[PDB]
Design a binder for this molecule. Sequence first.
Ligand code: CLA
Ligand code: CLA
Ligand code: CLA
Ligand code: CLA
Ligand code: CLA
Ligand code: BCR
Ligand code: BCR
Ligand code: BCR
Ligand code: LMT
Ligand code: HTG
Ligand code: CL
Ligand code: CL
Ligand code: FE2
Ligand code: MG
Lengths: 78, 342, 334, 36, 451, 35, 37, 62, 29
Amino acid sequence: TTGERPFSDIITSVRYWVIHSITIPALFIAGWLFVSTGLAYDVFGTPRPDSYYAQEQRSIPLVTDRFEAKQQVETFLE
Amino acid sequence: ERGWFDILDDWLKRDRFVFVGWSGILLFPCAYLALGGWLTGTTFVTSWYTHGLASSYLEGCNFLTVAVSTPANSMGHSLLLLWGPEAQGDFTRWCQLGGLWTFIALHGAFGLIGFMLRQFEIARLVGVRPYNAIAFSAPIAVFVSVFLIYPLGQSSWFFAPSFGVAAIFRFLLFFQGFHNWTLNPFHMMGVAGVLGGALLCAIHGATVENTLFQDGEGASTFRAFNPTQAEETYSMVTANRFWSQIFGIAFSNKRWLHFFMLFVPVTGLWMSAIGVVGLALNLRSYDFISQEIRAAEDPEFETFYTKNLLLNEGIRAWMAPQDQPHENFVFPEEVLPRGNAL
Amino acid sequence: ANLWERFCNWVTSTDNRLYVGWFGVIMIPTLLAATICFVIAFIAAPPVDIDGIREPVSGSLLYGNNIITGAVVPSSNAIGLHFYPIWEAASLDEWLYNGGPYQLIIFHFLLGASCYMGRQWELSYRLGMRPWICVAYSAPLASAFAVFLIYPIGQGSFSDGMPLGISGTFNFMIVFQAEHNILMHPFHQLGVAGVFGGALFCAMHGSLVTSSLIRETTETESANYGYKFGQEEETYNIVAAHGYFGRLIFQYASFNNSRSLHFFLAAWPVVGVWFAALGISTMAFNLNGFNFNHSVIDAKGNVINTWADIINRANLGMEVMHERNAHNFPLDLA
Amino acid sequence: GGRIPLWIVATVAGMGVIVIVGLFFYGAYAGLGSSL
Amino acid sequence: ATNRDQESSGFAWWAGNARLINLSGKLLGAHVAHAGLIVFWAGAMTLFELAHFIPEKPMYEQGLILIPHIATLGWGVGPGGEVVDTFPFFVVGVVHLISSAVLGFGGVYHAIRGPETLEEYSSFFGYDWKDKNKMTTILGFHLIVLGIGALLLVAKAMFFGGLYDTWAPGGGDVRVITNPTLDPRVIFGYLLKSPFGGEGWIVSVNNLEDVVGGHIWIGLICIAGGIWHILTTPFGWARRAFIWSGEAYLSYSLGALSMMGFIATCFVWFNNTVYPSEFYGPTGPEASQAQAMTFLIRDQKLGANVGSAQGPTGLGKYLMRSPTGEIIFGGETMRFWDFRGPWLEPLRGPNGLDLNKIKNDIQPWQERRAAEYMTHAPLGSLNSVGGVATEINSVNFVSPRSWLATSHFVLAFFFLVGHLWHAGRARAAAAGFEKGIDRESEPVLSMPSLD
Amino acid sequence: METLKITVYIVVTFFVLLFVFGFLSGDPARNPKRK
Amino acid sequence: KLPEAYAIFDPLVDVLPVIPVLFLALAFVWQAAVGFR
Amino acid sequence: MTILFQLALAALVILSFVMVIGVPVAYASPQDWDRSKQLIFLGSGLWIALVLVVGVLNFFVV
Amino acid sequence: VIAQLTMIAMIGIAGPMIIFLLAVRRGNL
Ligand code: CLA
Ligand code: CLA
Ligand code: CLA
Ligand code: CLA
Ligand code: CLA
Ligand SMILES: CC1=C(/C=C/C(C)=C/C=C/C(C)=C/C=C/C=C(C)/C=C/C=C(C)/C=C/C2=C(C)CCCC2(C)C)C(C)(C)CCC1
Ligand SMILES: CC1=C(/C=C/C(C)=C/C=C/C(C)=C/C=C/C=C(C)/C=C/C=C(C)/C=C/C2=C(C)CCCC2(C)C)C(C)(C)CCC1
Ligand SMILES: CC1=C(/C=C/C(C)=C/C=C/C(C)=C/C=C/C=C(C)/C=C/C=C(C)/C=C/C2=C(C)CCCC2(C)C)C(C)(C)CCC1
Ligand SMILES: CCCCCCCCCCCCO[C@@H]1O[C@H](CO)[C@@H](O[C@H]2O[C@H](CO)[C@@H](O)[C@H](O)[C@H]2O)[C@H](O)[C@H]1O
Ligand SMILES: CCCCCCCS[C@@H]1O[C@H](CO)[C@@H](O)[C@H](O)[C@H]1O
Ligand SMILES: [Cl-]
Ligand SMILES: [Cl-]
Ligand SMILES: [Fe+2]
Ligand SMILES: [Mg+2]
């Protein structure tokens, strides 16, 4: 009894569904594409399945230098 | 209704679906960012560069194995600010260096401050005593001791817990093998307050539900109660007689009963927090010296205490090379402690 | 009335300081026997060959233990699930070496605690109470059955029952983690939610009721004197408490119905602990925690470790070290 | 007021939850995370 | 909408089925519809298992629980448990699936369309829970039905092709039982056996003649008892001992199913006669013994003298004594020396495992079976990674024995809880205090103080 | 050991008999309300 | 495998065993329809 | 026989799905209950016939 | 894959379809 429209009124109204039958699927498709385009890997710097190791390297690219860690990751990525 | 301060105060304190308050200005952004940083990291962010682990749905982990992991040991106790000297404003690199860890831990810390200020604020407006805020000091002591003090006493944030289901399981096992934390009387007091609290929760709920007054015709008894009713909904007298006769003692004072329900778990969590402050310094209850002196001189003397240290020794040697990659441990097969066959 | 009728009247009397009852007729002597044997063994029992390999473990205070390390040690792996009462032994000295006290204690205790649960039903019926306090107690009781009886049955030996001691308990937990990955089992996770949530809601309820106690005392008196045993009127304002807590979260997240609130308080920890108990009782038959060891693999086939693999390494340390002289063959299959 | 009955909104919404969680379980057995 | 809200029935929606206690027609609907659910699952599950089934792999590598039940009855299988014909499996699945439509039909009809109460309509089909005579009559009918079910098993075993016999001389095979055990000293002797190790109460049944014989007795006992209950009314001592109400009777049956659930759990875990290891995988005891046998065979092939080989502890590395002197496998499997199985028995003599036989007579088929059983031990993760908890992913295996034991322990436990719930409720309701304490008639207020 | 066994068997039988006969002795009636 | 004549019904057979779970969930759809009265 | 068999099985399947929805709807419906009882009886006898048809045709296709 | 998904889709809809039909027709729910 704080004023706002009751949730049960909103989610059973035709107009809620007209707005949301477009916004909900649009958001979901945008999330889908953020991954399917590969963009998620690049924003966050997460390795793709082919990018954890070089072909013959077999030690992990562990960061070992506090202030030049950013440079280490850049060289590791080289 | 005066100056802007008092107009702002009015609006902050409106009776709405989600109360805001002055505390809301700290709470909401901090809780939102802690939770969102957790969902963002577990969904998208690796721990390859800090731990050599995959840790996100993106890389293939499930709800049990995802985490936002701590930064590399080389980061020490860096605040690891986005604009700080490590990431220098590069968001991608900051994610790869474990910046989301300190982001979550610190927003989470300020958020808990805001939640507790919210408990005080709402209590003051509604005119109740602020015991809920007081009780919440136990969650606070636990968060601060385990997520801040513990790693501050150790070499780096690397050894804080990582924010994940399996990551936290790993943290428990590490504390067993390295700190023998089960032997610690402050942890034992925590366990008593948690299990004793769950005990009080169960027994008090069951007793009320089983000493109810027949206040309606329904065989489903929940409707036969009214919040504004003057009368107790259940019989303290009958409840007292039952437990006096079953167990030997019983509550007779409802006020004492409810205070004790605050006291037990709040006190147990505060005790566990003190033990963790000691573990920040490796100041463990690891050993009983008299046990070791006897066992060293008498190879036929064995107790469950000596059996558990053998397990700890296994945990340390088997887990350390992958759990502490900055150490570059190489332990040749021949040095690993193992019993026969296994 | 006849002797029997008076006896029955006394056994079932609502007037005894401690209720006796028919369950109590079995509970009293069984709990007494388990208690006396436990106390004497914990002080004075000699070392027990728990793993059947002639390597006796000292559990008692007089043989070099303290309160934290002491235990009544499980019976010998050579016995397995065989029933080993005192009269099965050639002497008390043999019975002691083989961990006879453990069996005597746990069988009398389980019988007695089961009767403790029946007695709770029994008295509630004598008092005209609703009957389900005994159902709340079934949760801790089921958990004691899991660790002292069901687990040994599954694994084929009481030597794998939980020891009656503080450090023995931790030994049981650590070995159980090596052998079942319990932490990764959703029934143990539900038990954690049950006990952490039980503690949380215990503190919550204590604090909400305490916060809304009606002013009945002065500042120099404990507020507890504001309540008198057996008074009719409720001693706090639930509407005030709900008004606080509905605002802390949002209105519909808070109970204003005391009956619903108290039912939730009962149910949450009781259901969680039933799942804890069923976790142990089903890992008894080796249906174990989730195994994601090497679940994440890169494009070439390199294993990319996750936190699950680091758990695995800790589990391996427990596994290879436990009962270090008892395995001759490469698999630990119970 | 509402034109769409609450029991339908619930049923459709619940079914949607089952589908998306179902998909997440399928994914535990195929592609990344599948051990294969 | 007769009795279909809380106001009129006294029961909230989440206790809605309690609204049925005195509506025998709709309650019969609920019961028949539910029997259709059971029969449905049995038929659909069998077809699913059959559709997935690769006949040359062991059943126990395939997550099968129903085909193993059919195979044990001697359908579809030949020597060694080799599958010779999947058609009997198909027939079982289809007949249950079809039958469930019939039951589902009756269930829906009674629940939704037929008379809500049966008493007006029929005095034979109507009932009052408090009518002790009608209760024992209906109970008698069901007893006769159950007795006929038991004799159907005897009929299969004796007249319709036999049962799978893991113990058949020369190797497991389907065998017709011609000499079932009738001696009450053997049949009822099982019931008085200790449930502890080396005894195992009824779980110890180790031959099909005792199994068949027991069902001859049980079929007759049930039929006789069923007749008895149709023709009698409870004695006075029965009348004074029990609560007589629908909820009370539900509670007694909940207790009994809980007990049976625990018994089944132990049966599938230990018994390898009516749960042949050919179909269900090795028992835990069996796989552990098979490991010791494996390495004894290996190491003796390498030249070890396994009789005299002292292990690290001083006990024999391969062979030792049980606490009563029998020669048994050593290492941790000492606990499992009560185990008996067709691949091991040829090596056992009157003093336990025979060293002469071990040295000279172990056949390649015994080596194979012991390797198979060691490597199919019933250990595995919830996501079905076979092996110890530290095992890496590769082998998709959880034993049918683990699935069946764990499920039934869970069910048996919750059935005990439901027993306590309902037994305690039935007592309170019969005495009139199930809805709470009368504020003006609170029993404790009329009692003297404890002190 | 034989004497001990016999003694315990007697003790146990005695208490089990009390439990069974006791619950047989009109237990439903032993409540505060309807008998 | 199912006899070959029935193979076309394989995907249907894969889904049937789950139908009982659906009967439980149906009770909730129904109750939601009558407002859990 | 495979044509007859496979049509008979598809028919059984389809009639089943129709009955699964139609029987409960008919039973809890106010109006048109007379036209319903007939269809239910017809559907049921047809359902049973198809089972026997599939059952017999089975052996000419297996 | 599409086959099994279609099957469960029409099996899954059958229950709520029954309730829907009954509700529209003011049946005896
Ligand atoms: C109440 C809300 C709140 C609080 C308490 C915090 C707190 C914090 N944040 Mg978070 N943040 C918030 C809201 C908040 N944030 C919001 C809404 C966003 C979205 C924009 C963020 C996004 C965010 C990011 C991306 C990061 C943080 C980080 C931090 C940490 C370092 C902050 C710092 O050093 O500021 C220093 C600034 C102040 C203390 C303000 C002082 C104001 C004084 C009193 C007046 C002086 C002003 C002066 C006149 C200006 C002259 C400057 C001139 C010389 C140029 C700290 C835990 C960092 C972190 O978590 O690293 C791990 C980090 O990287 N925050
Ligand atoms: C095995 C599960 C099961 C069974 C067999 C029953 C049986 C029954 N319940 Mg219970 N119920 C259950 C689970 C079950 N319930 C669960 C899990 C809950 C909690 C959600 C409830 C909550 C509940 C309440 C609150 C009530 C019942 C009532 C009833 C009865 C009347 C139903 C009615 O009025 O339908 C009306 C519904 C319809 C007309 C919709 C269609 C229903 C049919 C049966 C669907 C059949 C679908 C099926 C696929 C058709 C196959 C046909 C084919 C073979 C040809 C009926 C005997 C009522 C009662 O006791 O009345 C006296 C009552 O008030 N139930
Ligand atoms: C006795 C019951 C029982 C047992 C022992 C099994 C056993 C098995 N099933 Mg079958 N099955 C069952 C009933 C059972 N099922 C039912 C009711 C259905 C219909 C849904 C199925 C449908 C089915 C399919 C479609 C498949 C199996 C398969 C399997 C195998 C792997 C199972 C797995 O991976 O589990 C995974 C484990 C879970 C999903 C966890 C279940 C835990 C539940 C939710 C907890 C129960 C708690 C309690 C009952 C709730 C009470 C609440 C409380 C408050 C009172 C295994 C042999 C698979 C197979 O290999 O076939 C060849 C397979 O594909 N089953
Ligand atoms: C245990 C289950 C059971 C019980 C106690 C009843 C009882 C009743 N039924 Mg219901 N019904 C059932 C199951 C049951 N039915 C099933 C499975 C179906 C679908 C086929 C129906 C469909 C149904 C309809 C459509 C009607 C009834 C009616 C009746 C009433 C009269 C029956 C009669 O007059 O006898 C007559 C009996 C015979 C002529 C002999 C029966 C021969 C049987 C089939 C052979 C027995 C073999 C064996 C024991 C079966 C084992 C089954 C097992 C393996 C599952 C009575 C209340 C009527 C009623 O409600 O009137 C208003 C009514 O119209 N029933
Ligand atoms: C589902 C099966 C079933 C059910 C529910 C009933 C129910 C009933 N029976 Mg019937 N009965 C049955 C099958 C059944 N019977 C069969 C198959 C037969 C033929 C053998 C009989 C022959 C029979 C007779 C001769 C009598 C009954 C009587 C009764 C009534 C009271 C029973 C009682 O007090 O038991 C409780 C049991 C006791 C009080 C005995 C003492 C308790 C002991 C010590 C318990 C020990 C068990 C323990 C848990 C160990 C289990 C393992 C064990 C095998 C070693 C009640 C209506 C009585 C009656 O009123 O007739 C009209 C009666 O005189 N029945
Ligand atoms: C009452 C009620 C209820 C319940 C209900 C029920 C429980 C019912 C049942 C039902 C049933 C129980 C049904 C069944 C059905 C069945 C059917 C319908 C079948 C069919 C089959 C077929 C068609 C087959 C086919 C085939 C063949 C022949 C061969 C192979 C292949 C195939 C499989 C394809 C509820 C809960 C809802 C709630 C409300 C009330
Ligand atoms: C088939 C078979 C067989 C056989 C079997 C048999 C022969 C069985 C029998 C069985 C029986 C013969 C059983 C019985 C049981 C009983 C019971 C289970 C009882 C119970 C009781 C009760 C429950 C009671 C109660 C009470 C009391 C105690 C007190 C008072 C009150 C009252 C009444 C409540 C064999 C093994 C050979 C092999 C395999 C198969
Ligand atoms: C055998 C066979 C068959 C059969 C079928 C049947 C028998 C069916 C049934 C079906 C059914 C039986 C179905 C059902 C469905 C259901 C559903 C789909 C539901 C869901 C639910 C939900 C989703 C819920 C939700 C909610 C509510 C409502 C309220 C509260 C909240 C919540 C959210 C929980 C056919 C014909 C194919 C043919 C071939 C063979
Ligand atoms: C090892 C288990 C032994 C197996 C026992 C076999 C069970 C069959 C028992 C039948 C006989 C029981 O008979 C039962 O005995 C008790 C004790 O004398 C009787 O006597 C009792 O009556 C009233 C009933 O309100 C009591 O208040 C009173 O204290 C008591 O004398 C019961 O009224 C009678 O019904
Ligand atoms: C957010 C912290 C703000 C601290 C308050 C600063 C006082 S500001 C204060 O506000 C008055 C309103 O009565 C004005 O009339 C006055 O001019 C001004 O001094
Ligand atoms: Cl150990
Ligand atoms: Cl071994
Ligand atoms: Fe309370
Ligand atoms: Mg995947």
